[model samples]
Target: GKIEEGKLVIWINGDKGYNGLAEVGKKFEKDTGIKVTVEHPDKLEEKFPQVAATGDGPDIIFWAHDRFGGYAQSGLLAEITPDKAFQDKLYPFTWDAVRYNGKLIAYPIAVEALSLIYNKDLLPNPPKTWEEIPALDKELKAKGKSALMFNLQEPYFTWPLIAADGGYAFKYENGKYDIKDVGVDNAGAKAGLTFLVDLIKNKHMNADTDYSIAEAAFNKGETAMTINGPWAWSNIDTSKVNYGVTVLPTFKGQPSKPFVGVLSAGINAASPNKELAKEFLENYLLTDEGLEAVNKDKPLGAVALKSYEEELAKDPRIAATMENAQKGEIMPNIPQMSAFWYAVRTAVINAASGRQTVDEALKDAQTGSDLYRQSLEIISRYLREQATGSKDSKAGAAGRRALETLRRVGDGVQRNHETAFQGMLRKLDIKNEGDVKSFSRVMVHVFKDGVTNWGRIVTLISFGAFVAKHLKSVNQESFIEPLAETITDVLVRTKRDWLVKQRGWDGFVEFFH
Candidate 1:
């Protein structure tokens, strides 16, 4: 009955940028039987805090890329995974946009970042480099203050200038990230920082203003130019301002591409309407539906990589913005980001309060970021070079073959955990198993290839033997942890023997299970 007459509710940061989305509701209602009620606000951030606290928020709400990161880390979001079949159709980066640690976290709507928008009548050609910013400012200074970009307390505001100076915020390594590779110290970032320092020094880059203030200033011609995203393009009142927009400045071959904000729709973790919410998103947020909605209003870009290009190509300005946006970067949804941002945010506000040099503020920022990095479990394999006092004892070729057999079973486990679990239980004649997390760890060797496979198999066999042979009468409390350890040691030793590598016997398992 619930599925028969479906209900659809969408929550948008009800503001002017989203005034266009309401037209989508009307179109959607007229086209499909689904009814949608959207919540847009004049004060979106304020509204979000209220909605976030209630958790009874809208069924389908607009999402902010970086904001969702903190919420997800705190366990405030649903683990919204659609089947790989449909997800494969999305752009590679689009899939990556709403993901955190190999899990789908949100549904992307658009790729957005600030562009250098100027009143065309005022400045014909936009500055092409961060170094050129000051000169452009000086030229426009006497005419009145004009900003090249938005300056806000958040560290994100600093991104484009850093990029213009040939800097990246974080470094990507082989398969993981090394957060310690802070680009704040990069030469380009330093140059970009110098440019920003000059902007502050010359009083041309900022104010004690919010985004709306900056928007209003631009609309009224109080400022000749400002850094803004596509959403802000409609605010220019095309009836008034003859504005020209361009990609941000470039120092090297690369332009200053700020953080590309991926607006997504996150399902609320505690919503009773989860299945319905999922249904709505599965149907409503698809490129077909969402893109049609955009077509009704601003005819903007869709986040689905395919439809976005198709829809945005119609508008040359939107296409240029999309091209420029292609150079934009997806913000990292890593959980530990909050620590760095909060630490730096405070110091930045202090700098904005007008006492210390940018160097002093940035120095504090670096220290805070470094300290936060040290506290994360992000690099778990740091003890790789250390010597182990314990040695591997030969567990024999007979069991090695059995270990191989178990690995095939493990492969089944990796391929399909439930099938593997049922197979293991039926084979071992153990039933009524519970404890999913620990159980997955126990059977993980089936999925993992090299050393991990041997370790899990050997450990299990050794554990069964160890438990049957000794400590058969220990308390449940004392038995579980120790039994788990014995299993791991046996597996490690068995692996070491097979691979001719040293086995780990730390009296504790070193990796997350």
Candidate 2:
């Protein structure tokens, strides 16, 4: 690839103040005689992959660190080796988000996480422990208010509670995530869920609460406190609420751990002018003047530079968010994380709705997650064989067609299954081939006319255990090979490049590990 002479291209989200970087770009052009062009494109995330895979993407991309792992593993991002002096100038915690697979993949710009934002008029002093929250609830009830509220359906907001008592989404060891060591159903996580359920049952918090409901109540002074982040400041300020920000209370004397998210800039690996882009990132964007321009209109939350500590501390809200972030766990950036989000969200909703006990819900989450992992593993293995030309190409093509059929059925279900298929799940009973045939007929009918949300899809896939049991009772070889082939075919057709970047099934597994 040849360098596009004397030019650098950058892509950032529109709402993130793209114009704020105009001055930085101008300064770089004037000083180095190299032109700079920054474009804020719609659907930048989705578009970046399609273009980058073809070596036709921007020199640099401004985005969150959560996507760094996927991009880096895909060979779409350039690895950075910042000097020790440069690294020492930023918060050590921020680096954790940019580093993946033991290498630096991006530059951390800003960091943020959840904190306790409370009404000053209602509670002069915030509770120090979760156990004390119930007492606050009793005190607030006399005034027709609630003690605390947050989005119950979001695993991101509720994760602190789940992790407060030694629970974790995955066990992290030696600078990597252990995906197989899920802790959502462990005793600590159960304790956290129990606390949430108890709060709802005791009327200390509303059962139907979400981000909107919680934020609105807190804004109107109807709630004593809310667990939120710096992003909520504008709305809170506009509502004229007298508020205070502080670290989240402990759970049974243990510190809570929110998930930390970092805003970062990554150089595209395919960019021809790598050195020039690196120069721009290191010399311009990380400077005080550059950061000032970027944050001129809307202040960024907890900038990573140690030089900004005094400035950030001037705003108590930002300081509190940063403080909480220091105690937070980094949000995992693997594609397999897609499963965690679906599973945990379903568990929380089911448990909160009383459809399942906390124990049952978390256990189901663990089991379903394990099964999903297995499916990915089996599918990825087959794709690897096909990529290496070790398997018949025709079989791979057949598998892809089967997967396409399934996707078409899902689309059909999404378009037409709004009302007719909701009641069919209660009537299905599969014991023999006749029953399986009936189940298949009903599924096809529903697929032709059903509303299939992700949660329902997850439930349908839980039938893997049943399928496995039957396969065990028959000629296993007859079923296992074709099943693997079909699943692999679908995955390859849909996500071949991504799977290849992750190094087939091994990399996917190691990512979570």
Candidate 3:
């Protein structure tokens, strides 16, 4: 990791408006004589992973908790053990968002979740249940206004409705998420999806509504109410709409549970200033004065510190968001959550657009999510197997290095060779169910062209490994030999020139060992 003597660097998203943090940094510099620099970088997620791999990124990062799991697993985040007293002062639920594999990887600063925001000038009293909404909608219609609106296609906003009847993206039990136990297609989930579809079919909400449309309508006072988080308040306040925030109304006799997200700061594992970063977060950022300064310019949804409760309660909107957050489920911070987003978005679009029935859309979501989850497991197992191999004899040691190099190369391909990899997939005309036959075709295609490199070689092997593992799981061992032979033949025929340049297996051992 690179080290800058007596200086600390922090990266924050551009939209967060670093005014509060800038003030805090000035004070930290004056007190500790250590310069503090705050920067808002574009594409922080993509850049951080690449730079952190080589120990050249920022000392700290301020972002949402959902990114915590991927960064922690990639060994790019440092684990922190705050003093028990300090830890006890913060809301316990916020901690759940930053912990990965039983270790605290970041410090929670603020909490947020979706809640019902309404225009006080239009609806003097907000509805308390889903049944109450229809009556309200009829009244609003007389005034040429809609009763409620939100990004109906976004899973984040619509999840509360779906979850009101026990729908879940993934099952969390005994401290970990069971990615395999997806609940998006269960009877309860179907009930929730049907409710959403009914809202559109019954003309209570528009199927074409999206985030920007909902935000704009609410800001212009064209819509009576909307479902959004505190992040929307800045624009709404600027628009001068007489608005009030409240917990979502009950749906079908059940409370709506939105996903709660925590804004947190994490230390870079590759930074040389781990201890210094920790000191600044605990002794400076976590203090009451520090928390106050942070919320001075741009109000946070709700501070995570318990002592700030009374002060935060003074702001009715923050108080309501906090209350709803208490009842909401913490957003899962696992890497597999990517599959959930894809699956849910597909279901929402297809079902709401009338391309598929709610039942059919949900079933498609379940199958797609299940397959993606299985693929992630296969890749994980392949990486693990490469890392843990026999290391006794010369050949054994060489073989271990070769496998490890392939694993690293495969990772590089995913991040850097994305276009080329996707091109090969398209060239092969491979579909999901093609399975090992797709792997065989890809291997042959890699050699058909005279262009060969480590990236292509590694990708072919890893894809083959994934197919082989999936086959073994289903008791289909007969295809394994033919696939292995195809891979060998492809390498020998087209990759011979590159392989011999560094003496085959010995080159891999010498280069990576």
Candidate 4:
């Protein structure tokens, strides 16, 4: 056993992120007579899949919950079920984030959700709803102050408005996320976007407001309020302008449910020491004492353990974060959710800034990115098969050519990055689910034709299982975000730009057209 060998390996981002856990690691080693080594790979997302693909990854990988599904679907992470004693201690949503398609896949670490962080000097008490905002704006404007400031350009912060208005990234259906039923362009979403537009057009807050602008304005006493998360704590100069954090105010009396992100530790399914890994994670890391060490490193918000909530509740900051999180939806870590972020943010930014009408932005946001994601997923599935070596040699070789074709699908998007974003999106539409399924049914047959060996078939089945369990987890990140990043080695590289030129730009355009 590795316990007898006295060695355990875990990968964390590096230095600052892992320092807090050092003490815990030391104490664990002493108690269990095992040597624990923390490996900080410069880029976990890049390095992780490379290592895992080779079946030589660390026993545990620490990260936010967003990539759980992509990696889990790639069959890179282990499904972990903590004993009742351990599971009972964690917050329900935290547990949910670690689960894929109803299977437990990791250990919850800490929970952080967005809240209204305000300057107490301006806001004696935070407004209860947006209805109070207009009048507050009037008063604040008289003093040459801004009423509400936030990185409205970023969808992560803006999404609460949509949630409050009853919109969601996807519909939850039959124990899974129904990616086909996107909610971004629904009526509720339009209502929310309309209000966001009003905030910019009538309320005077413009779409150009980003994180830096919002944070600087608030801290400088130039703004009364801003929407931010606990992660922004270190940057606040709370001394000059004291701040009070509270749950987001209601919009038309609807609850402002921000996306609650739970940080957690995931086990490697391919780890040689899974039993030993489970022993460490369950017996040591998830315990109250272990949690204290974990918190000591980075204690921005609440730990998932209910028992610790009482003491953590004493801190105003933690209390507000936890309270807001109570009404929030767990940030979906499933693959489909990947399509939600950038496109929605672009739409929000455009609508908020007056670049596009609310209706236009919502339409673009929902359709463009959603299609891009679906396209990306289909491409990713093909790429994954290529990387793992399809059972059919000819099929494996053809996969490379298929990817080469995809690369040519788009060369230039448009005049600007945003339009280019829209341009790339305009290319993909299968007409209907019948067409989508028709092609999908073709893919199955293609895969069937490609595989000539029994071993390849077994591996194909395993890959299929990964997709079923993980991507299907409906769990719902950055270009380099999600499962897409996990298989980067399979896609995106210097392909000899000369080759593209040699192929002829117009030649490739004709291929896609």
What local lDDT score does residue 235 receive in model 1, on the 0 to 100 scale?
58
lDDT of each: 0.56, 0.71, 0.75, 0.66
Over 100-155, each residue of candidate 2 has an lDDT whose tens digit, in order, gives 88889888988868899899999899998888998889977998888998998677
User: In model 3, which range of ten residues has the least summed lDDT?
Assistant: 386-395
Mind giving the per-residue lDDT tens digits that candidate 4 earns over 1-513?
A: 222234668887642246557667788788877778887787675687778866777788887687777788778888886778778888787887888877877888778788998888887898999768878898889988988988875587888888887888877778767666677778888987788788778856876877788888888889998998765664564436788888889987898888888777888876777777788877787677877775665564787787776567788888888778888877778855544665587778778777778887776666543453343453455434433434333313333443455433311221224444335335534344343334333334455344333233223323322332333333320111233433222211222122122232223324454
TM-score of each: 0.64, 0.64, 0.69, 0.64
- 1-513 in candidate 3: lDDT tens per residue? 365756789998765646778778888988988888999898676688778867788889988788778889879898987988889989888887898888999999888788899999998899988778777888889999999999976678888878888888778786677766788888877887787787888899988798888999999999999998876787798999999999898888988888888889999887888888988998888778887787765667878888886577788888788678877788888865655666788888888888989987786676555543332333334433433332323113444555566566655555465555446544432234455445555556757786565556566666555545444555555655555555664554465445544445446446655
Per-model tally of clashing residue pairs: 7, 6, 0, 5
lDDT of 1 by residue, 250-270 (tens): 755567777777777787665
> Candidate 3: which stretches are off by over 4 Å?
1-9, 14-17, 30-57, 201-208, 355-357, 376-513
The candidate 4 region of ten consecutive residues with least summed lDDT is: 490-499
Error of 3 at 393 (Å): 32
Count of clashes in candidate 3: 0
Model 2: pairs clashing at backbone N, Cα or C within 3 Å: 177-512, 177-513, 179-512, 417-449, 417-450, 417-451
> Which candidate has the highest TM-score of all?
3
Q: Which pairs clash inside model 1?
A: 11-60, 14-40, 14-41, 15-41, 410-446, 455-491, 459-491
